[PDB]
């Protein structure tokens, strides 16, 4: 959206102002103040846009941003852990299924009519 572009432009303006003010400025010092005011206005606009959009975020995202890292790795980790949970669930499901099948075929001779009715009803 336009809010991200405004934030990037404000950050670039702040970086340029910091680069200009790193040494002694022979020109007037009001340019940095004007850039700071523009950055504050852009931040206010971005805050208003975020309030309108109403994004909901958890805390784990906050401590993940605190260290500093793109969320793509976190989404990869979530996908791989969900896939691992799915694989172990599939494993337990197929093990109980094969256990049921082996106990059914193992004791097929105890009462043929019961097995016939079980197969018919299924």
């Amino acid at each position: 959206h336009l809010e991200e572009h405004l934030e990037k432009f404000v950050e670039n303006i702040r970086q340029l102002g910091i680069i200009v003010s790193d040494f002694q400025p022979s020109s007037q010092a009001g340019l940095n103040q004007k850039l700071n005011f523009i950055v504050t206005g852009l931040q206010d606009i971005d805050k208003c846009r975020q309030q309108l959009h109403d994004i909901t975020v958890p805390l784990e995202v906050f401590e993940y941003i605190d260290q500093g890292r793109n969320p793509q790795l976190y989404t990869k980790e979530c996908l791989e852990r969900a896939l691992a949970k799915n694989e172990q669930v599939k494993g337990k499901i197929d093990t109980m299924k094969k256990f049921k099948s082996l106990l059914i075929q193992e004791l097929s001779k105890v009462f043929p009519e019961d097995m016939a009715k079980y197969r018919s009803i299924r």
Binding site: F37, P71, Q72, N86
Partner: protein
Amino acid sequence: GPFYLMRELPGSTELTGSTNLITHYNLEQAYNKFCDLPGMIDLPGSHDRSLIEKPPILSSGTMLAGFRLHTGPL
């Protein structure tokens, strides 16, 4: 003949945990993509009270201001 207290088993395959829940929930291509952004952020800028900002985020007059404070050039 009939055994005591037989009843009807549920619908043959309703929603279970034995299905592939992700591919049914249309999330496959994101995973196939996925399987630092500070660095991503770093490319745009330089590098990536960072102690102070976190604390501020943990809890959760532009023209006039400029006129009010004057900073010596040298």
